[PDB]
Amino acid sequence: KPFSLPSLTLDELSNSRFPAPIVQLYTNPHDNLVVQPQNGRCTIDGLLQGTTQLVSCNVCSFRGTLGDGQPAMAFNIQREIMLENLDGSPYDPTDDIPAVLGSPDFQGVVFGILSQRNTDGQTRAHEAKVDTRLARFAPKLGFVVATVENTDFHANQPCRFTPVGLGGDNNRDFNQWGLPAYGGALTNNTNLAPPVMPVYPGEQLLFFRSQLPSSGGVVGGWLDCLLPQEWVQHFFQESATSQSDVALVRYINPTTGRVLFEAKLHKQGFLTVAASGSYPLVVPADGYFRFESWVNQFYTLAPMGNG
Amino acid sequence: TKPFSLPSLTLDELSNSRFPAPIVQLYTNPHDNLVVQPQNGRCTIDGLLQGTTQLVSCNVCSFRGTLGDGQPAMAFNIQREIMLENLDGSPYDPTDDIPAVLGSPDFQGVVFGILSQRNTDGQTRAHEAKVDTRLARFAPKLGFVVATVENTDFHANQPCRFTPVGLGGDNNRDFNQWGLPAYGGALTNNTNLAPPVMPVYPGEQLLFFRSQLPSSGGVVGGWLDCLLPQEWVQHFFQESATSQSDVALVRYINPTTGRVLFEAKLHKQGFLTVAASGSYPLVVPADGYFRFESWVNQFYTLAPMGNG
């Protein structure tokens, strides 16, 4: 019940908003952004929020029953997935969540594989895209549309969508901080984990950053999470009582043992730093965060610099 | 000096250490005529990784490197070599004390997935691909594997990443989960292997954390057993707790009643055994969980498992 962090190094962690390794720490100003992801939301005393669930390989997956194909770009056949929960139990659209757990929490096209294993055991699997911006992207209601090129799919049989990366044509097709309309076009999102922002003037959010694969275009594919998936799992299991609203943490150089920078880990489940501008930190990827002490919101962090 | 513990994640909160897939069952079978020697998901309960085991869940069975030119040889009928890097993009050292590049598949089969690229100029593409671990040129110890593709839209001498999704064979005989690939290529001897595992108490059987993989063709079961889930591997690595004996007694608990459903031994080498006979999935709640009970010795007699 004393608070703790996992000791996994930066390059041992994975993203909580997509199954991808963490490759960088990244900071930027929060001006004209609402930062309100729904995956990778866990308070540091262990309360999961939004669409956050614990299975790393399930983030941005879908599972359910595949419907008939209809027309309408090689990916020009649309098939609906009537969703289940990721464990195969019936999805309850009335649960106090924004959408089926694991649903993507960004506007974009997820590229991956749609696989099937029929009731008789016959299997198939092919490329597929799930466009989270579509009017019929409605995982709160329990329906999404998959777009495919291949005609070899069976209606009224189980399916699983395994995400691999992005499937748009350019950077404008991917808006990582824009939430989808989970209930479909022209509906209001519900049960959202709240937005996050620095409270101390001059501070910026610090993200754990991945770079996703992409099926087309000159696409950066950068995806920021508030906490890596292992920190989410750790806080959930530990459920340590938060002695204040701010845990001071320090990032350590593994060679020297020297502190490289300080950050605040806020109780709501995100980091801030004393930095200005938009950049990836220059720090050893085999460094790691160490919990130091409980402080208050007036604590002044040492300037981060480049890291 | 450092007390032992298990993660408190339930069965349906865990993932496989030999492939990125959820754990769906606990499974037991006799070890007769099997050498059980997986190389992923190998961690001693005091935190020593072995074989090709690494800590990133989404990297298990992935490959990374530079894609080569296409050659012929039936939809997946173009072959392209991947010259491998480590999964973090650092240069792969074929002389490290490991069986193959960390994360390499540890079974004979065809891995179906996506081969993606981001060129030096930023242009991207990604398409279906298969990696057949039985091929003569499957040689991740040397640092080369062959990807088979249908799509002609790939660029040679540009970076690539293979993300595994499931199996890509045509039938159950194309997948042999306990058969190791020849990591150095055809007609070469494997090195630096995590050792085989087996029950020592007569009559006991291994207990596995089991997943079911997707498949691109055939009536394929896709069942994959690991010795420890990926989260236990991460936990033991971080904790590196003192093993007071070679055998930790653990019990699987019903979350509704709090009742013990069955007992198992968690051996220091990093695997479970049970007092059971035959080949079957346990009938237990998927939201149950293991609880560490005490340190015992190899003579401890487990209560019969039954169905679970």
Residue numbers in the entry:
A (entry chain A): 225 to 296, 306 to 540
B (entry chain B): 224 to 296, 306 to 540
Sentences from the paper on this structure:
Genogroup II (GII) noroviruses consist of human noroviruses (huNoVs) that generally bind histo-blood group antigens (HBGAs) as host factors and three porcine norovirus (porNoV) genotypes (GII.11/18/19) that form a genetic lineage lacking HBGA-binding ability. In this study, we solved the P protein crystal structures of a GII.11 porNoV (VA34) that was isolated from pig caecum contents in 1997 in Japan and a close-related GII.3 huNoV (TV24) that was isolated in 1977 in the USA, representing one of the earliest huNoV isolates, focusing on their HBSs compared with the previously known ones.
In contrast, the porNoV VA34 P protein did not bind these saliva samples (OD < 0.1) and it did not bind the oligosaccharides representing A, B, and H antigens either (OD < 0.1). Although 10 oligosaccharides representing various HBGAs and a ganglioside were used to co-crystallize with the VA34 P proteins individually, no extra electron density was seen other than the native P protein, consistent with the negative results of HBGA binding assay and glycan array screening. However, the sequence compositions and the structure of the VA34 site corresponding to the HBSs of the TV24 and other GII huNoVs appeared to be conserved (Figures 4 and 7(A and B)), indicating that this site of VA34 is under functional selection over time during evolution. Thus, the two mutations damage the structure and function of the HBS and explain the lack of HBGA binding ability of GII.11 porNoV VA34. The primary variations in both sequences and structures between the two P proteins are at the surface loops between β-strands, mainly in the P2 subdomains that form the top surface of the viral protrusions, most likely contributing to the differences in their antigenicity and HBSs.
